[PDB]
Amino acid sequence: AMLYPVLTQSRLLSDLSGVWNFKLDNGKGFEEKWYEKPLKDADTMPVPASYNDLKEGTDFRDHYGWVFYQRNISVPEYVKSQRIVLRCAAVTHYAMIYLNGKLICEHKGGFLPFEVELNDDLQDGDNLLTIAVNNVIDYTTLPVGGKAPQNNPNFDFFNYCGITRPVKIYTTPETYINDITVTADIDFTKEEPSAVLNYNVEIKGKDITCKVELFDEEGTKLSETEGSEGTFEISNVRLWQPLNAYLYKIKVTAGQDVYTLPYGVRSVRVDGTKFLINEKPFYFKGYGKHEDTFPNGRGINLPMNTKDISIMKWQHANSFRTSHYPYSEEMMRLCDEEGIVVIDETTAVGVNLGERIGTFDKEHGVQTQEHHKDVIRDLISRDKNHACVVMWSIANEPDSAAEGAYDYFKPLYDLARELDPQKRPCTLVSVQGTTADTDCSSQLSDVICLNRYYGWYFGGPDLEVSETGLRKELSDWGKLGKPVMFTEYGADTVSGLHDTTSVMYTEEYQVEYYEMNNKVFDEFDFVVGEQAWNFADFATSQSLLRVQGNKKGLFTRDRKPKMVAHYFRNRWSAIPEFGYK
Amino acid sequence: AMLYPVLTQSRLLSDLSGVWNFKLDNGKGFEEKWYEKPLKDADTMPVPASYNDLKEGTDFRDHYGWVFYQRNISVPEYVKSQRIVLRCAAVTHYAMIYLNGKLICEHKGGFLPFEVELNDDLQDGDNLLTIAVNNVIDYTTLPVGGKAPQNNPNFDFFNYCGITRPVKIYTTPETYINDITVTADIDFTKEEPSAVLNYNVEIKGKDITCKVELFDEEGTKLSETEGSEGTFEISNVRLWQPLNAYLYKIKVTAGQDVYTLPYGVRSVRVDGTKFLINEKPFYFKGYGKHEDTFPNGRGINLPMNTKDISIMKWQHANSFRTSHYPYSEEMMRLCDEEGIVVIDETTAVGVNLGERIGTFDKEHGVQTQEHHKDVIRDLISRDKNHACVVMWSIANEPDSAAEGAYDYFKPLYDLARELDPQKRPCTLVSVQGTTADTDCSSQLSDVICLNRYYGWYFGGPDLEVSETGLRKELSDWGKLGKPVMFTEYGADTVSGLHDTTSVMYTEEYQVEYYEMNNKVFDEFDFVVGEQAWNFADFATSQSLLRVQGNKKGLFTRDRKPKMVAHYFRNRWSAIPEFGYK
């Protein structure tokens, strides 16, 4: 259970962000117990941010192993009466928190929050907070790291590591609000849709009165309820809608603690080959994104988030997929405010491939299902209340058509559907090569999400031949009667390369590629969404197939529009959110 | 008096940063008293950051007038016992702070901090904090804005406005440390240089004991002193040096309040035509920078700051000038940690130009000297203790060779030299066209800082002819016997444009331009520094002479190296910090 720490009349919030003491481990780092004394010959490193690109030389960018963040923490004794918590929004990949020298916390998982209590191990004056981060990836990590001293990522994006998201401190009374949940049953039958909202507060500590208050957009009060559980009757409810968002406020007063939560009233339901939002046939318009900026790397970047959402509404999009890892809490909340449809995805990327071993080989294969279940647990525990999240993605391009694959995902799908209070659709992004008959996603998933590159990796530069292929496979996928959407498709384009008679990597070819694909898409009424790959150019590991990173983005890494970006904006302008099919 | 709010055993610090409620004024904004009720139909805007580039359309970028930031503030009553302060690191240009509807603070000045007290006007639960920002510039603002409904900046950089730097909240006991000052008298006579440091603490409130403690780099204690004033004897003092920084810690315990301060022991003194740091002949290597990134605009950007300082040490630079406005506190402190020489400059840019009026015309001219004195007051009050600041710049390219000019600056120079506890050199950046005989900087300034463009605006593309000119004027400047340095010189280069036989705007020409200039520079021993313009490409107002902004940077706006960047790195590698002349 992880609530987003905010500022409230009952709780504080001190951002530990700034320039910390930084030092690359040299192997002897742990034996010599650097976490006690200061960082001798320390360096400077801003937090939050990925450290790989913040210094020159490959030895900082391509570091293998541990790095030590160090900082000076201090609290006034008049606050020790409250509950002190250290919240780490994200640490990529493996974090180990020390306080004066005592290991107080550990976490496996570089893209989800985790907190620890500081009341017992604090001191009186200056305390030495030491956060050690590991970047190693292997068959036991999500994302998955291969092998053939450097990390070999089994994924197509750079291994940005470090304190990726903010590290803050917040307080709370002894008996506090530890978690909250809210679902909505919307009565679309009446001429005006009314709504009934069910809540459930979980307290913790030496309990015992609980109060909840409902407010609207402006802040006007609307109703009140008592107890750890209750409901709200909203006649004339203002439904959260794609691109037309509306968020109510919820103020829960429990004992000596208060916490507010913005909630969006909307319904999500799959019906045959139709993805229904608020009981209407929705069509996905957008692209798979990355949390990738320069030189922040994977580090949080609120200004760029607002710019991207501006570029999106500029382009007439409505959705994106948190490609290959969960995004920041801030970006999720922003999509609630701005009304952006989001496909929340886990870190489960790279679960694929004297003898060739098999993905799900019990002895020499991925050892990730345990942690994979944790992520599904922690991901939903965090974003369960986000009205923008309309579906979960268990994994990106796994070996979903291989032996043991179905056995691997079935418990994960179940855990997901048993944990989502709203019981939202579940899916997995199908790598190219799978078919309706071979993909275990055909049975497990509510929506089929394809990653196809007809016209690039498969068929390019012959777009004519590539078209018949795309049509042949897409037509086959209709046999399932489920909703089909493309979550990835694009061609690497180096901004600035032009040609009248186009060739691969030019801006002209990139547009043609999306014209041919979109043409086929519109031929089938069970295609309920198109999301291009990628929103913008992003960094990867070096390779002959990567022209200074991934260049399949519609925009450059600095958000500048390629010619394709205008193409889509024109297309998506004449395509509505509902009723397209 | 403005101390940098940090985290201490006696004081808190809650970063109000995040996505605030935003709304462009429409004229009726103030009459309709938006600062009381919420922002109806509000928008999203991250803080801190310039808002001009965070939304699409010229109407947000080219807005004229007011914008309303709104936010929800809340404090627990158990903290009301302390002193509550709202610190605004920067608001560009004019800020007006409301709390529940009551105007509680105002400030003129978009690039320096200002705080206000919240104890008296707080409420119990949720408070509506409303920060209104104005972007208008005219003859009464610094920077100066001209005329011929839009702002016409009298300067060559875009008018990025909004909550440019962080807005935080910090507490402190009734009797607190309000200000601190530290100077150093270094005895360079002994074989080992010892040092004596003089401090001076200023308290405020219902007083009455004061304690100060000195620590070194690691954190080991070194000495102790009592009283609001005292000294420290440092035998074997570790002198802060350019590119070899060393900062001591200073822990002042006054009553129920503590505050720590990193200090760097170094001496600055001009001797004839020699700029002496720690009694050695220093040579400036660097460039004039901007606080300009995309899409942040002028907004703070700690990751880029660390990257720029990496690029600098990569390039073998040692100094930069806070071109045309004071930079963030974080960047100043970082230069102390990283050992970067800084020329702190004020916002006094644009003080230049049926009849042609004169700059300092008493009735129809710049009405800025009053505010100009404030900035000189507040700038030194903030950065007085930064061992990286080795000189002050009263103004950039003013009309320093016109009637009334000398009368305008003389009181400003005096106020500067009377306020700097360290009595550091003072100068002003001389626009092209001035000569040793005409520039009032010849008498007022300790160091001559020239902004010359021989080979671009003046002479280009004939670099041969441009050379004789540069030599003729530079030789003349030697008549003063003072130290001369170029704070600006460069040629607009569009990254990617190449030619064997170079032309203007190509990368080849840019290198040639700096070769010719640097050749002449090295012919004169009274030239003690070279700083190119600019560090990287930055945004300006649109114009036929601006190719999508200013492109004179050595690096692109995203910090990528142009061919010139490697040229300098090779040159600056064979040029030392001391003894070059």
Ligand SMILES: O=C(O)[C@H]1O[C@@H](N2CCC(=C3c4ccc(Cl)cc4CCc4cc(O)cnc43)CC2)[C@H](O)[C@@H](O)[C@@H]1O
């Ligand atoms: O096209 C992208 O590369 C982007 O789209 C997705 N991406 C899709 C392409 C991927 C493949 C792959 C898998 C099966 C077959 Cl038959 C062909 C190919 C192409 C070449 C190839 C070569 C390899 O060595 C490894 N993996 C592949 C999987 C990855 C990913 O989801 C995304 O991370 C990536 O950036």
Ligand SMILES: O=C(O)[C@H]1O[C@@H](N2CCC(=C3c4ccc(Cl)cc4CCc4cc(O)cnc43)CC2)[C@H](O)[C@@H](O)[C@@H]1O
């Ligand atoms: O070259 C830059 O433009 C950069 O260097 C500095 N910059 C120097 C060039 C500036 C001038 C100027 C002034 C006197 C004379 Cl004789 C010629 C010229 C050139 C053209 C010209 C045209 C105008 O309409 C107004 N101002 C000028 C002053 C400004 C500034 O300090 C910096 O802000 C700027 O970005």
